[PDB]
Symmetry: D2
Subunit: 62 residues, 4 copies
């Protein structure tokens, strides 16, 4: 399974919640989770930061 889907489920967030908390448009989140497309390089780097620090990342965006 795609890394974003692993990370989101491990944080116990719905797609809607993860989309709003981390500023990833919901359709593209769904594309990534379904294998319809893949995150580009800055997005992969961003997903790694979310994984390392989900709370710090979420707080920085608020």
């Amino acid at each position: 399974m795609p890394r974003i889907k692993i990370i989101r489920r491990a944080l116990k967030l719905t797609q809607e919640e993860f989309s709003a908390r981390y500023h990833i448009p919901l359709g593209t989140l769904r594309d990534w989770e379904q294998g319809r497309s893949e995150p580009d390089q800055p997005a992969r780097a961003y997903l790694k930061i979310i994984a390392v620090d989900p709370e710090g990342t979420a707080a920085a965006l608020r």
Copy 2:
């Protein structure tokens, strides 16, 4: 000036250095800095995290 260019200069990094440290392909970094295109939503969110924590972000990617 574009936010990425502000952030990079404030960190005293060349385009090459910033590109490698933060996993943003060099041509697209240059496009953003020159106003030839603009970062999408996940990229803007990512740039905000870099700005809030440049060292933590860089370390997480290593």
Copy 3:
């Protein structure tokens, strides 16, 4: 309304059909149609070609 939604409805295609015919991942099509994100420069150019020649474009991709 977003240009892609105009074009798709004018061609009488569902989101699924338009996505498969024109190789635009379905989630991002939905993001564009709902105003959750906007097509980047190559995508806007591509949408203009689809609009000018929907059949020629579709045939070229097959």
Copy 4:
């Protein structure tokens, strides 16, 4: 070599010319040609249309 670089050289266009004619930001064109990143799905579809009809495509954008 990347498809975009093949297509551009076969059309005898410089990077600048190809960028302006086909509305692909110059830095990202350079990233694609150098293997620093790869075109997403709508961009690949678009490049195929350019390849099939370079003149029709260019004219449609004017």
